[PDB]
Design an enzyme around this catalytic site. Structure first.
Site, PDB file in Angstrom:
ATOM      1  CG  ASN B  23      -3.333   1.230  -1.882  1.00 33.76           C
ATOM      2  OD1 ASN B  23      -3.687   0.882  -2.998  1.00 33.76           O
ATOM      3  ND2 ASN B  23      -3.219   0.377  -0.864  1.00 33.76           N
ATOM      4  CB  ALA B  24      -4.890   4.909  -5.928  1.00 31.68           C
ATOM      5  CE1 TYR B  95      -8.177   6.857  -4.288  1.00 29.96           C
ATOM      6  CE2 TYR B  95     -10.120   6.123  -3.077  1.00 29.96           C
ATOM      7  CZ  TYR B  95      -9.536   6.590  -4.246  1.00 29.96           C
ATOM      8  OH  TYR B  95     -10.318   6.752  -5.387  1.00 29.96           O
ATOM      9  CB  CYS B  96      -2.835   9.524  -1.267  1.00 23.15           C
ATOM     10  SG  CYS B  96      -1.607   8.674  -0.211  1.00 23.15           S
ATOM     11  CE  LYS B  97       1.782   6.703  -8.284  1.00 20.39           C
ATOM     12  NZ  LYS B  97       2.848   7.530  -8.917  1.00 20.39           N
TER      13      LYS B  97
END
Ligand code: NA
Ligand code: NA
Ligand SMILES: [Zn+2]
Ligand SMILES: [Zn+2]
Ligand SMILES: [Zn+2]
Ligand SMILES: [Zn+2]
EC number: 3.1.3.16
Lengths: 159, 159
Positions: B23-24, B95-97
């Site tokens: 994740n971010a 990754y994403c948020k």
């Protein structure tokens, strides 16, 4: 528009088959992007807008135009994304804010990496398509290092 | 820190050799990125921050997590950038948020494209590394279309 010329120039120009260089005003030029068969915009900036065109992917390469910036580490994966879009039949547009340093350096890298051109030959091709193309001198050094790596890897000849 | 455990978990987990999902919050984890030998962060978001770590490239894939979004067109060039970083010896973090839909879909695509796994096998691997991984159902459909294309291209077997 089938006229009659276009008053304003297109915001990009063809460097080689399936390869265009331009500036961030291309982002909003939906119809020109589709007409050119562009399927991937490589946006070499941190804050410039991307396209919102159907069937057009964006990949952002978030580097400042500064000689101290590490463009080099981005080059191999960026050029690979470009080649994959090209081999799948699309055209690639590489742009930065003003179409000068960053986009020129990335197009030049791609031509060495995937079209068999030496640094000098590759940059001459970019320059011919877009005279204001001019990688900053830090990026030029990084391109030379990339060229040497490509030679060591047998991707480019020593000649 | 050679202790003693780490109170907070790392913001990513290993899916397969040279491949991580997260994740971010990973963006700012400079030391963990360097320690894992990550050389490319694939940031699948429009506004999540990128890394500022030495020797770590970022490529941003600016898609919303929405079933109507066109992740599909991004998949082939994104996976190619990933494979190029991997073949050059680095590890890739996607990754994403929140490390759920977008990053899962991209890691799943990469495993089908470059590791020879079927969609189901590829997604099982992502899920095992990160249980909350869950591509939205629109992305799942797009992944199925990608799988069929890979089969037509002889990249994946029909089996
Ligand atoms: Na130089
Ligand atoms: Na489905
Ligand atoms: Zn700016
Ligand atoms: Zn700026
Ligand atoms: Zn947001
Ligand atoms: Zn959002």
């Amino acid at each position: 528009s089938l006229g009659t010329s276009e008053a304003a120039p297109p915001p990009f120009a063809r460097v080689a088959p399936a390869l265009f260089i331009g500036n961030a005003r291309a982002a909003g030029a939906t119809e020109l992007l589709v007409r050119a068969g562009i399927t991937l915009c490589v946006n070499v900036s941190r804050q410039q807008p991307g396209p919102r065109a159907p069937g057009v992917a964006e990949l952002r390469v978030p580097v400042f135009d500064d000689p101290a910036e590490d463009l080099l580490t981005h080059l191999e994966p960026t050029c690979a994304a470009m080649e994959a879009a090209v081999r799948d039949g699309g055209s690639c547009l590489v742009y930065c804010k003003n179409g000068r340093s960053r986009s020129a350096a990335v197009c030049t890298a791609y031509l060495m990496r995937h079209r068999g051109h030496s640094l000098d030959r590759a940059f001459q091709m970019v320059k011919s398509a877009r005279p204001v193309a001019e990688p900053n001198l830090g990026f030029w050094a990084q391109l030379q290092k990339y060229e040497q790596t490509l030679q060591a890897q047998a991707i480019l000849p020593r000649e």
